[PDB]
Amino acid sequence: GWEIPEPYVWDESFRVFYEQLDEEHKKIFKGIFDCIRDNSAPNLATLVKVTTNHFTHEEAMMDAAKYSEVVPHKKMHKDFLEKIGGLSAPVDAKNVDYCKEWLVNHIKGTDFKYKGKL
Ligand SMILES: [Cl-]
Ligand SMILES: [Cl-]
Incomplete structure (x- = not known):
């Protein structure tokens, strides 16, 4: 990865x-970054809030563009919100690592497929 x-x-990059x-x-x-350094209930919820807002927006742009790889991409988003939505503070090190990995891998392996397509 x-x-x-x-x-x-x-x-x-x-x-x-x-x-x-x-x-x-x-x-x-x-x-x-903030959940890593201050692993609090507000920062986890802020993370859930900013990630839900981003996913709704990015999906709106893929749907508006009739981007044909939108359906597996939406499933990726749905599964991630379900996972971080199910967490509670303090988030353990495995799940913090999962989140660090997921964001990096999601943007460069899946969001990159829509470059110049939206
Ligand atoms: Cl790279
Ligand atoms: Cl094109």
């Missing part, structure tokens, strides 16, 4: 060139 940033921050989606990706990196 792709390199997990340490510190856990977005960098330009994750860019999709759709400004609001890129800004959304930057806030999910920051949401996980």
Whole structure:
């Protein structure tokens, strides 16, 4: 899989060139970064909030564009929200690692497929 940033921050290799989606990706990196350093019930819920908002938006753009790989992508999103929606603070190290991995892998292995398509 792709390199997990340490510190856990977005960098330009994750860019999709759709400004609001890129800004959304930057806030999910920051949401996980904050849960790592302050593994609190508010930060977990903020993470769930910013990830649900991003997924609704990215799906709206894929549907508007009639992007034909939207259906497996939506399933990826649904499963992730179900997993982080089911967590409670403090999130254990396995699940923090899962989240760090999932974001990196999701943007470069799946969100990258819509580059120039939305
Ligand atoms: Cl890379
Ligand atoms: Cl095209």
